[model samples]
Target chain A: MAELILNQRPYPRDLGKIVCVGRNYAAHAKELNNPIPSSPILFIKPASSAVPFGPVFSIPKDQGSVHHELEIAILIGKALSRASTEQVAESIAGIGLGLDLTLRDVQDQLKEKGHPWERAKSFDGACPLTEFVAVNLASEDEWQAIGLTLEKNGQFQQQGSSAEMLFPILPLIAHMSEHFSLQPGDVILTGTPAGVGPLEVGDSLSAKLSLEDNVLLTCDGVVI
Target chain B: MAELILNQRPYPRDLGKIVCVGRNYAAHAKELNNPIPSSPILFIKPASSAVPFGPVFSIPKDQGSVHHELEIAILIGKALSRASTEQVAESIAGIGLGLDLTLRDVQDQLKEKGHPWERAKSFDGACPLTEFVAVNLASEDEWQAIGLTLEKNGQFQQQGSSAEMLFPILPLIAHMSEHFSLQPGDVILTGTPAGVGPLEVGDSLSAKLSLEDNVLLTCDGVVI
Candidate 1:
């Protein structure tokens, strides 16, 4: 890709769309009282939803409360369909953090009314993504050890890792590719962990996506 | 910008996405036992859904009964967001017909769970479109009078006009653009009429887009 300043250069990976998994973490499902899905519960976001994460990003007004869901994101660098975990490693170019900004109040109503979540979940600028730090997927243990942390104003907001995901990265990606082919530049958000709450204006947050002691990426964001 | 024989010529419209409407026709809502929507019920299909219509299109198997819905399709030539009704019509570069395929069994389960309908509605090859014909939107009378008819095996199956729609085309597009920006080459499917049911293999369908005595477009499709 190109570059932008998460660490600061304008970055470009040829993103076509964002594929999101719902309730991939059991505790998250319990927190929402949602039945843990036996399979990966999937949805999509238009490429237009992709927006820079950091010092400046705006949330929709009058739509209800916006919630911050921190997640581990995967960047696919190879075309994959019906691929095996053995084939999943080389295809992953990087890993980073993602904020699946959601209009929680609106989503509740949509969930109650049986409507598609696009209005509440796929709004423009809804996905604020951080610049990726390359990942070495060659080691299975390292892949499982990846973790992410989110803090708001020096207070811990969400902390979870790949260890908690019901559908691990490789197999999850494999499952998604079976339904929707994954292409280079496409990003996948494994799922959000238990901690989620409303995002207020003027709030600052920092995220740390790391493996063991090696920090792969970090970023900041302000709600406006 | 590509090649496909529809009305026998190369089609150059560069489509990005397809925005679909649900339950615009009251009869359709009642037929399905769905309450009339207070607002346009909207959803989307990926660009990959844009495939040539005629004789050969495939529907997913083993999922559920595949249903055929015929509707008026509009091609937007200008970017529009929060536009006026008048602005909506003028931006339409062409008019055509669309087949909004549905996996009824799968959709019902999704609706019951208030889950996103991607697997049921947004699968590849889900939307079959015809070559567009030029449209003259100088009069609301013509637009409001627009109608579509579905013929299964040469027998009238579903017949409806914009006159029966809860939210007519122009304003509907205006409303959609307000939520999701409409780009040139984006296609809008005004909700289907009352006649919708399962599409069996080898079943033939004729979709007619008509306004008064002016026949704009006609296409035939076979389920496989």
Candidate 2:
């Protein structure tokens, strides 16, 4: 069974739903020619799709164009329903990084037909998550100033700070709780920054999470 | 805090992901003007969307046109990843009925924009599940003979047999396992029949599950 690791110890709760935000970065939407949304575009990837961040990971074969979308991941520590922004922030058990692995061609076909995105986005091994680390941020500004970056094949593929998010983390999570109730162990992928593209087999992947100038966590892996 | 019940006892499992099929019934697809899919249309609803099969259930307010799509619900009792047909059937713990509540207007808007359907089909209280009952069938013929019916305001609104499904239950589930893995406590909504429509406040609702000549289960509720 999949479990979230916290500071080298296993989290006490079972992994739950993975709630994700789409196009939360304006540059990403523009890059894909997707219009800026009036509100957040939300989707879900089931727990079964989760795998631990790895020294190795497998991507689907014969499915066209799997893309890598790296985002800041949040682990919820408490139950939340229609929660306040303050409460939403306090519910964060850990902060980590996750790759929202997407099947680009399948996703495009589903979108063209107005079908649900699950088939393209919720496959097994779609979400390879990194171990989480505890963080204490005193203000919203500190939260907004957090940064994430991705390097593939020794080249910087994506880089952005939370300051670029159309919907900031605290209020964004509060907005999510208004619709779907969140629980301990539930994961939130805030959103991805621009520079998403297809992954090739044997590609080396590296990612990092940072709070202002302080680098908090780093992960390394290869497409298997 | 939602759970699945078997007989009069609580089933020993935590509520997990809701895996749903869309337009499995040809009649339903024709009614909605959606093309008969070449394969099953699949989606995921987070666990937070589940509520007990109710004497009363609340629909969303001001979301525009909350439609009731009643379906045969299957509860999984074992983990399945790329399972076989027989293995998939063996994993079924119980069979019941559920409401795949949809925000039709919102869904239409999402479809037009090529957006994800979570906001339309996966909100809080979106899936109301009935207590499950054990069922044993010897053959595929026996399984396909199962029937489900829905009545609203003392009128038969929808009725369907498993024989009408374009993708049979066992194989459809096996196909799902090939994509997103299934776990114990997970529920499956096998797709709605025709005659899905908006629900009015104070509407009386009735539903039933049947096997060949015998009615296996029945439920009563009111829209609140």
Candidate 3:
């Protein structure tokens, strides 16, 4: 039961899906002992997993090991199917930061069995989001120039630049639309960096996104 | 876009997710050359893929072979999370029929690489659904005893019964809720039986569901 925020207002309705990318960053793939994908690795989290940023989000107790993956979230404002780069650029209404939480142990088991990752990656409150700021970016180079960082208790845990993304932005959205239609209110998590690690019961995490010299968004949350 | 029906009327909005079971029937598992799963084999299609059943539903061309999987769809009426068998029973708003369209070749390639099935199974217009009828089950055994048959052109293509489902409705829903939240308007597609094959353009298909001697649903569509 979470609603996406665009600019300062909430979306008209709840999101339907949270399409996420994997192996988008080469270092992350290598760190996880995975091969570089020939194509973008796509998976989805249902709307029930999303929650707005502010209050502490609780992790599933008794679940073996939970990990925190900070990512850039792109919000869609228009319907896009088999769209071009221009259409994808126009469809992005907002940009923000989010935590793509993962149950590492459960995910490892599913991956080894060639099973769907829904159980480990799409549990309730798995995605926690910061309020988005309206996007003014378009094209490959401009999008690839943005940067972000995740800090846990005043220490930098992960840092990522869009320049390191294997699939870039516009082309990824277009390719994504070629499979699943990108509709208004649906958010796409671009991917995470190399330093994804375990989250403890009382860990405090904060993230920030910046485009050039101007700061776009900064948010914080605690694990309960 | 497709909207689920409730008691002869359409739902307020379109569905969000289509939770599907795999290898739920022993015949289907054996046919696919897959081992019987110890637990339910679950996967999902997003809302963007659903379209109303009609004269024709388009399939992805040039990429690979598309296959038709006829299944019984259960429409959830209320919000559910970690619900009990009784709660799952009360939450069922309707029972209907659907087609879980899949890209067989693409799925096979993905399976070989242990990749997510979204590219093959969650493509746009991958699920076509018919209007639902209210459920008035006499008993759990009676409901599980329901049967269905699929017709391609003028010949019988497949036949299945709920009695063959290794994971029956109530317990299945309860288990699904344990992993992911089941919201109102979400759908659960009980697995198909044997006789799954590739689809080609101009092929007309129809399916019928019956409980005892009473017909529960009938739907028809063509591949385009």
Candidate 4:
């Protein structure tokens, strides 16, 4: 296995699996009528669907509606499986923002029919990633307050923070590794905090992570 | 973000998402008791869960049973959405063997409860990928005659070929691009044939693309 590059730019190499945490935020979980989980719900997105930060994304024209769930992204530096919370903390590398893009209409249909979400949630460009900044500068134990907002045509739709997460970072990652191995180069996407809706043609959206003095990055894109 | 390094080696740059085609083979559809799909059934495995070719994989301990479904892996070298069959053929990069690892118990429960398969199919190490040889060395058409077989403890358990595929490769991938954007580094698992069964600890497994070649990779592991 060779190294993986993104958008023709050579990545660090030895790309690992991506670990995604679902419904970490209480408000976002509640919004979806899901319970505040006793443990983190872990999922994975493959490296293949990774899309670079760009000016435009296209929604599947056939799908009824596409939705955007903004989230904070974490890059793992070391592999941890069934690791302790302390061990998980040591795996942190960098943090950024991402869009957990979804095909709402297809997902709803699949949900109704009792089907897997791969059709709706796992499509190409379904997971849009942002450039990351090293997290070494921040206090390791702090809540690492991050901001997530999504606007449609300049209209505010969602605003959230990592402070509202039901399961904080380290513990959640530990829980995932206990069930699924986390590899180096793997990315972990903390759940969105609410305000999810449809994306349409020409809709411009932006997201920010760790706002205020800790602001990491801001990105903008248009839906094609 | 920095690039990823694996096993002290840099992986291929510009690796795209892994896209999987479901129920493309005729016998597989019949075995699952599903109607032959009019179009390719599309799904995805995120780059996060990819495991490099190794001799063994561990099934989740909590899951009751894990099943093995082998298939041909297609690697994409260019970005394409709504591409025609010819265009899809032109984008081929390489071909490899892969396993669609499944948590049978969880998947059964989901099927019974009419839930999504993500919990069972999309976990870490659920997709184990092998090194790829160029497409030209394999076959010309996207749906070329290829062999898929699975053996446990040196006994044949499952075997089949692409000649029986209900939906051949080119059209299948072209249909997929119509619904989702296909990017470089993305892979497509074209679906598995019949002879699926549970895997156990100390089980040794091997598979080949066809009969002309006896070359097979052997894997041994436990259902942890």
Higher-scoring candidate on TM-score, 2 or 4: 2
iRMSD, all candidates: 1.3, 0.7, 1.2, 3.4
Error of 4 at B183 (Å): 5.2
lDDT string for model 2 (B1-224, tens) is 56789886898998888899999999899999989998888998888898877798799998899999999999899899999989988899989999999999999999998899999999998999999998888875677987999999999999999989998888988899998888899889999999999998999899999999589999999999
What is residue B21's positional error in candidate 4, in angstroms? 2.4
Q: Residue B178 error for model 4, in Å? A: 3.8
lDDT for each residue of candidate 3 in B22-51, tens digit (9 for 90 to 100): 888899889988899989878888889888
What is the C-alpha lDDT profile of model 2 across A1-224, one tens digit per residue? 56889877988988998999998999999999989987999999888888977787689999899999999999999899999999988898888999999999999999999999999999988999999988665565678888999999999999999989999999999999988899999999999999999988899989999988689888999998
**CA lDDT of every candidate:** 0.81, 0.90, 0.85, 0.69
Candidate closer to the true structure by lDDT (higher is better), 2 or 4: 2
Judged by DockQ cut-offs, is candidate 2 incorrect, acceptable, medium or high?
Answer: high
TM-score list, all predictions: 0.92, 0.98, 0.97, 0.79
Q: lDDT score, residue B151, model 3?
A: 95
lDDT of 1 by residue, A155-178 (tens): 998989898789999889888876
Better of 1 and 3 by TM-score: 3
Q: List the candidate 1 regions with Cα displacement exceeding 4 Å.
A: A1-14, B1-13
RMSD per model, one decimal: 2.8, 1.1, 1.5, 5.1
Point out where model 3 deviates above 4 Å: A137-140
TM-score of chain A, all candidates: 0.93, 0.98, 0.96, 0.88
